[PDB]
Structures are given as C-alpha cells and as structure tokens.
C-alpha cells in the first residue's frame, strides 16, 4: 500500500570488501594504515608493539609467542562455536530488524 524498500548504496559484497581491507591493513601493517600509508610490519612484531602499549615489556610476547598464538587461535575457535550454537548472540541486530 505505497510501501517501498530502497536498496543500500554499498552492497553486502562491498561492505565485506571494506572489512577485508580493514583486516588486511590491520594484520599486515598495524595501526599505520590509519596514520598514513600501510607500513608493513611482521605480525609478531606488531603484537610486540601492542604488548608495549598495555605496559607489558615486549620480550614477554617473544618469549611466549607460541602460547599467545595458541590462546588467540583457540579464542577465535570459541567465537565460531558461540555464534554457530547461539543465534541470540545477534540480539541487537535482530531486535532492530524486528
């Protein structure tokens, strides 16, 4: 009854190409792609800067790199298990749609 729905300007594929670029910037270059050009840096050295930014001396990362990497990989695993099992995790977005 005169209701219409207009499409978004960015397609969900364009949105996913922006999140791809933000990931690939963050992983390959740290914060530096926000400050200017993406300065490449090895991810373990970027992680050692990020440790120095919480006041934990960077050797604590290099001397524990296998453990810190396993804790990251394993925590990303548990994100999938949460989202796959628990649709009510998306409760803010589904509430807006409702």
């Amino acid at each position: 009854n005169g209701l219409t729905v207009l499409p978004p300007l960015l397609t969900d594929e364009m949105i996913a190409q922006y999140t791809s670029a933000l990931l690939a910037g963050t992983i390959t270059s740290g914060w530096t792609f926000g400050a200017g050009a993406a300065l490449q840096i090895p991810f373990a050295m970027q992680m050692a800067y990020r440790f120095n930014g919480i006041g934990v001396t960077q050797n604590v990362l290099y001397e524990n790199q296998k453990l810190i990497a396993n804790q990251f990989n394993s925590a990303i695993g548990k994100i999938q298990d949460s989202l796959s099992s628990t649709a009510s995790a998306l409760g803010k977005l589904q509430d807006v749609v409702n």
């Binding site: 400050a35 200017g36 300065l39 090895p42 050797n59 001397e63």
Partner: protein, 146 residues
C-alpha cells in the same frame, strides 16, 4: 496538527544538534586544550594540535597532524643474539640496510648503532622465533680499554 508536526521535528533536530554540540565540546577539550591519542578523533594522521575557528552556528577545527612519508623497506628482527643474551630495543625496532644492523625509532628513520644503552636483555638465543645474530656495542668497554 501543523504546529505539533513542526515542534516534534524541531525536538528531534535539536537532539541531533545537541549530539553534535557535545561532540564539538569534546573536540574542544581533547583536540584543542590537549593532544589526542584517540585515532582519527582529531583528524587523520597522528594528532599534534588543533585550532578552533568560529563559523555561523558552528565551530571549525584546523587539526594539525603528523603524517609519515617516504618509507624505506628494511630487513627486521624481534631481538639480537649477543654473547648468549637476547637483546630487545628499549624503544624502536631493529632494522638492517642489507649488511649492517641498527635500532631506529618506529615513526621516523633515525638509525643508531645497537648498544647496551638502547637495548635490554631478556633470557637467551634459544627461545625467540626469528632472533638474528649481530654484535651489541657496550659503550663502557673502550673507556676501560683506552
């Protein structure tokens, strides 16, 4: 009904202006009266300072920012092996121009000779993934030897 429609949309528009006045008041405090660590809050680049200029029903911030330029690619390492010791930079990163090793600060290329003054020890060569052997100059040593 026409006046109620106008007042309702002015009340919703006043809330948008007030959200923008709260943002402007916060950029005043953090960008102008301070220096901001909040990324892209006080403009793109690393924030240095901001200057407010007034405008009709608004404010304009001239955000001065340091933007880095003229990258060089270098070989890099997490740590340096010396006499069993693993050395890490106190500040900066290890970089190499192919054949020699330096420590530089992170946001500008200023290569310094690697020493016990610009690096700190922790543990030994075995642990670190990708440590690279190079001498670490101890500045005291020539002062005793001379």
């Amino acid at each position: 009904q026409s006046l109620q429609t106008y007042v309702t949309q002015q009340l919703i528009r006043a809330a948008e202006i007030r959200a923008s006045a709260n943002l402007a008041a916060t950029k005043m405090s953090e960008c102008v009266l301070g220096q901001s660590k909040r990324v892209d809050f006080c403009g793109k680049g690393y924030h240095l300072m901001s200057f407010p200029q007034s405008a009709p029903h608004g404010v304009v911030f001239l955000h001065v920012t340091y933007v880095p330029a003229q990258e060089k690619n270098f070989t890099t390492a997490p740590a340096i092996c010396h006499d069993g010791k693993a050395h890490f930079p106190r500040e900066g990163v290890f970089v190499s121009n192919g054949t020699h090793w330096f420590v530089t600060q992170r946001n500008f290329y200023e290569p310094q000779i690697i020493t016990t003054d610009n690096t700190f020890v922790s543990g030994n060569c075995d642990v670190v993934i990708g440590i690279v052997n190079n001498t670490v100059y101890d500045p005291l040593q020539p002062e005793l030897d001379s």
